[PDB]
Design a protein around this nucleic acid. Structure first.
Length: 44
DNA sequence: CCAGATCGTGCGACACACCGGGCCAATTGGCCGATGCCGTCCCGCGAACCCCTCTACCGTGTTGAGCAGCAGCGGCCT
């Protein structure tokens, strides 16, 4: 808690590092597969 | 002295006083009935009016003064 919240948010967002193209593609594939599995679970 | 103003009195006219008759003028004022133009409304289409949606070279950091409470520290006490 500080009188300035912009600095707090800025310093908070930087903890997570960046990502590369292959990582992005792998994450997208994970999202797709997870949602399709969720739909399959929705099936009875 | 005696003669006109004032008034008494008299005769007439007479402008209406009555209270009652017998008709009339003017002037209606309603809408009667018939005819006609405007208000309202129900679409009809179209101009605009507002809302929602999407674009893939990429790109990764904003004074002074007065009064009171809290944090750090010196120094007993165990």
């Amino acid at each position: 808690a500080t009188a300035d919240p912009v600095k707090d948010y800025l310093k908070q967002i930087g903890k997570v590092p960046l990502l590369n193209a292959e990582q992005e593609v792998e994450l997208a594939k994970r999202i797709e597969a997870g949602l399709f599995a969720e739909d399959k679970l929705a099936n009875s």
